[PDB]
């Protein structure tokens, strides 16, 4: 049957279409993974259905009960056959599910408030001395 593809809502990976209220099917969502899931489908020649995870979480092992949620939890227990999402490749997730080669390389970066250039005052030549 159609392959169920679990996905998490995150811009610009997947977002909501402008007319998604009237739209139905996989066309309801647009984003990076929407086309990413499309390109793999044509190459592998299969039909896919895009679905959003119920809990809206990426996935993390719960040490108390040993339960997996999110992308990985759906895959291990069989709700979905493939996850098309910005899922980080980690050691804990690799021993549970299969990760392909990375399609996007990232890392920790620094965000700062960019300066708004500079607008010298008209009478800024009087700056060296006080009023």
């Amino acid at each position: 049957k159609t392959v169920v593809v679990t996905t998490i809502l995150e811009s610009p990976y997947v977002m909501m279409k402008k007319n998604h209220e009237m739209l139905e099917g996989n066309e309801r969502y647009e984003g990076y993974c929407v086309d990413l899931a499309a390109e793999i489908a044509k190459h592998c020649g299969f039909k896919y259905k895009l679905t959003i995870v119920g809990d809206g979480k990426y996935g993390a092992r719960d040490a108390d009960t040993k339960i997996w949620n999110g992308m990985v939890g759906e895959l291990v227990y069989g709700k979905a056959d493939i996850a098309i999402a910005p899922l980080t490749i980690t050691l804990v997730r690799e021993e549970v599910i299969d990760f392909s080669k990375p399609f996007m390389s990232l890392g920790i970066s620094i965000m700062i408030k960019k300066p708004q250039k500079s607008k010298p005052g008209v009478f800024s030549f009087l700056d060296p001395l006080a009023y």
Partner: protein, 129 residues
């Protein structure tokens, strides 16, 4: 401003002098300078003063006994040169606001012949004055 050597070459997009995309006002002086540039009041005033000086010179021939007309023409020419100077200063100052018209190190903006026509117009008007 019209596109050059581009896909949409020939598209003369109007210059927006009030970039209210971010809804910012900053200080009153910046708004006043932006309004002064947008109306181009000083180059237009220079043109008007040059026209008045020319008409005074033309009317000076008709009224030979009235020497005060020639003085008025000279005053108009000098004021036109001063207004042209103010217009050039305001134009360059407002141009410094946007990175594309500034940062000659990387952008390497170049002044066209139309700008140098106004620069030459100021010199001639002062010479005639």
């Amino acid at each position: 401003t019209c596109c050059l050597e581009g896909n949409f070459k020939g598209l003369c997009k109007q210059i927006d002098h009030f970039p209210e995309d971010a809804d910012y006002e900053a200080d009153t002086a910046e708004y006043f300078l932006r309004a002064v540039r947008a109306s181009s009041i000083f180059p237009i005033l220079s043109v008007i003063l040059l026209f008045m000086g020319g008409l005074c010179i033309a009317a000076s021939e008709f009224y030979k006994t009235r020497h005060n007309i020639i003085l008025s023409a000279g005053i108009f020419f000098v004021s036109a040169g001063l207004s042209n100077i103010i217009g050039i200063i305001v134009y360059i100052s407002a141009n410094a606001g946007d990175p594309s018209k500034s940062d000659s190190k990387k952008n390497s903006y170049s002044y066209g012949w139309s700008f140098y026509f106004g620069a030459l117009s100021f010199i001639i008007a002062e010479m005639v004055g």
